Structures are given as C-alpha cells and as structure tokens.
Amino acid sequence: DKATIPSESPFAAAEVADGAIVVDIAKMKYETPELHVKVGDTVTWINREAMPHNVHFVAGVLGEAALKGPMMKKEQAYSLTFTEAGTYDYHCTPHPFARGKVVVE
Template sequence: MHFKTYAFLAIFVTILVTVVTAAQISVAIENFSFKSQTVKIRINDSVQWTNKDRAGHTATSDTGVWDSGMLATGASFSRTFTQRGSFPYHCAPHPGMKGTVIVE
C-alpha cells in the first residue's frame, strides 16, 4: 500500500480507538457529598455529575477549569478531560463538599 494510505489508516484507527475507549464516569451528588469522592479516569474520558439531592449543588473546579453552575434535582453536567492531572473541585454553596478527578 501507498504510504499515504498507511498514514490515513493510522489516523483513522487512532481516532476510532479514542472514540471507542473513551468512557463516561458517573458521579452522584447525594446526601451533600460526591460519590465517588475521587475518580480516576483516562485522558478523553468524561465525568457526568448528577444531582440526586433535593438541594441544589454545583461541581466547581477549585482552579477555575470548569463550573457546572447550579444543578437542580435530577440535573446533570458532563465534562470531558483532555489533559492529565489532578483536578480538585467543590460545591459552590457548600464548600465542605469536595471531590477530585484524577486524569491518568
């Protein structure tokens, strides 16, 4: 096969593998805490927070990387993590609620 064909195939397979293996991790907001409090994910995975409390909550990055805004009961917020690192977050109205997303 021609080199260009190989290059195209390599890119295609890389994209396919990324799409197929990217996972979505669910974090419940329940009883004024994030469950699980710490999640370990891979690059390109997403985390979806769902508020299961009657009170409103947020998932707000400690360092300003993201902010879900206020989530009412049953509301969800999803974010895809494209960089490695440890991302601590909290709930804006309840600063005692803390969590961490670790991207490996």
C-alpha cells in the first residue's frame, strides 16, 4: 500500500506522542485541509468534537481498497504512515463535505 496503519482502531488523544504530525478535526472540518509531509512520516488525526469522525480514502488512493478509517470518538486519534509519494485525498464518512488531502513528497 501507500500507507501503513499503526493502530487499526482509534486511541486516546492524550497518548499521541509529543512531536506527532497532527491534523485536528474541529468545527466540523479538517483544520489542516492540505498537509505536506515526507515519505515515512506518520500523520495523526485527532477528533476534538463530540460527534464521531473518521478519515476515508476511496479505493485506489492509499492502496487497492478504500481505507475507511474507524470512527474516532471525542478526543480520540488515528494515524497513518505514508510510505510513498503522492497526493492522497480523503473525506469524513459521516460528514463528506469535510475534505482534506495529504501531499507526500
């Protein structure tokens, strides 16, 4: 694939390491809708709100299958490690007007 998944299910925001590359989900949006990272970097999304949110990459983007991330509860996190350069668009499954991309260089 173009990314590996450190944790298949969400984990506590408070457990996210200092230094992590974090995208906040707040105000019903990805607060960094265009993020540029380097190959090998891990991106961590953190849901700051009460409604559950995820990240969802359609098939062919991160790999053959869609990556429909797990629903993060408030103050939960979810990470992806990008292993190949590319431009990877995603959206929130419950709230698909919220869209983002990770550009991996």
